[PDB]
């Protein structure tokens, strides 16, 4: 499954996104939305970034049971999009 998407996963996606941000001298911000009531809260994270290489912006919107997971999934979608658009290489590290 990650095999279809350049071996980008929840555990390596944020690092690779931040490295893209650094190389491009941009900064993306996670925008969070509360889901469920206060005693059963989970999160939407979303982010929009302009990609110089493509001349267009991309977007991700993901749910997680906590803020950390919501942000990791958001970065995962973003990074997998960049992979399939050829902006970003397949993951080369270890698994």
- Strand residue runs (E) in 3-91: 31-35, 42-51, 56-64
- Closer of 38 and 94 to RNA (Cβ): 94
Indicate the residue among 18 and 34 with the shorter CB distance to RNA. 18
Other CB atoms within 10 A of residue 12 CB:
19
Q: Of 37 and 93, which CB lies nearer to RNA in the complex structure?
A: 93
Q: Contact at 8 Å (CB) between 68 and 45?
A: no
| Least Å from the CB of residue 12 to RNA | 6
User: Smallest distance from the beta carbon of 29 to RNA, in angstroms?
Assistant: 12
CB of 81 to RNA, least distance (A): 18
Edge-to-edge strand ranges of the sheet holding 56-64? 31-35, 42-51, 56-64
Which residues in this chain contact RNA in the complex, by CB under 7 A?
10-12, 14-15, 18-19, 22-23, 72, 93
């Amino acid at each position: 499954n990650a095999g279809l998407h350049g071996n980008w996963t929840l555990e390596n996606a944020k690092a690779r996104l931040n490295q893209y941000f650094q190389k491009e001298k941009i900064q993306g911000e996670y925008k969070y939305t509360q889901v469920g009531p206060d005693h059963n809260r989970s999160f939407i994270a979303e982010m929009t970034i302009y990609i110089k290489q493509l001349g267009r912006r991309i977007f991700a919107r993901e749910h997680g049971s906590n803020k950390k997971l919501a942000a990791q999934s958001c970065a995962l979608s973003l990074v997998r999009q960049l992979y399939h658009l050829g902006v970003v290489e397949a993951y080369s590290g270890l698994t």
